[PDB]
Design a protein around this ligand. Structure first.
Ligand SMILES: [Zn+2]
Ligand SMILES: [Zn+2]
Lengths: 135, 5, 136, 5
């Protein structure tokens, strides 16, 4: 086996996430290339093509067949330490591995923060709007 | 591809 | 955070495993030198000096203060892969590590089935004896 | 030392 929270570091686990991914043979954003890129497929009905970096948590939709998932990665999240990782997983040192996994747990915290802040501004807008309607 | 919603 | 099952690979975790370990500083078989040798303290009310190699599962009590845990390990389980491991943990490669962790799970089963076997034979002896007594 | 039991 292998601890379940470390799976996303494994290319094959990532590939495995692509359920009804539409871009297959002939396309440049195949499940395979996506996984190589660090993406995991996390589809909702509202956006069935939603892919997310397991490391930086940056979320990307509106995929088109010619999209090279790696360039899209560099483009929409230039600072993702995964991109820098040039070794295969098992060539990584455990120290290196734990460094990476540390940054990822922090990226995760940043992300939740950024979310909470967005939810906060959202509810504020509602409040301000309701208040104007009252004023 | 583009940043989410 | 290191998943709980991989802890024993960590020297520190192994030391921390030692509670009320009688031998100590001034003694060759310190907790520190035990961990380094791969042992955990699995003390039983019987003998709170029960130690086990986390890797080959070889078990040893009745320790002597001048016993060199590494020497005692090699002698008892000559073919324990841990003994070959010369790099620090974080120095290990994910491959190297994965290879070691399979090795260990393998040793674990070999240990357990070895128990099953011996237990079975003992049951087999009691049954045969009882059938024999019935012949008489 | 010695192997258990
Ligand atoms: Zn990323
Ligand atoms: Zn051993």
């Amino acid at each position: 086996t292998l601890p379940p929270a470390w799976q996303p570091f494994l290319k094959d686990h990532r590939i495995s996430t692509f359920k009804n991914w539409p871009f297959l043979e002939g396309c440049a954003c195949t499940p395979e290339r996506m996984a190589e890129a660090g993406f995991i497929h996390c589809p909702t009905e509202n956006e069935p093509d939603l892919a997310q970096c397991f490391f930086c948590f940056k979320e990307l939709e509106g995929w088109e067949p010619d999209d090279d998932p790696i360039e899209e990665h560099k483009k929409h999240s230039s600072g993702c330490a995964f991109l820098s990782v040039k070794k295969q997983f098992e060539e990584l040192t455990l120290g290196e591995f734990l460094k990476l996994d540390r940054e990822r747990a922090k990226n995760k915290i940043a992300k939740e923060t950024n979310n909470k802040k967005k939810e906060f501004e959202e509810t504020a807008k509602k409040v301000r709007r309701a208040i104007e309607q009252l004023a | 591809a583009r940043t989410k919603q």
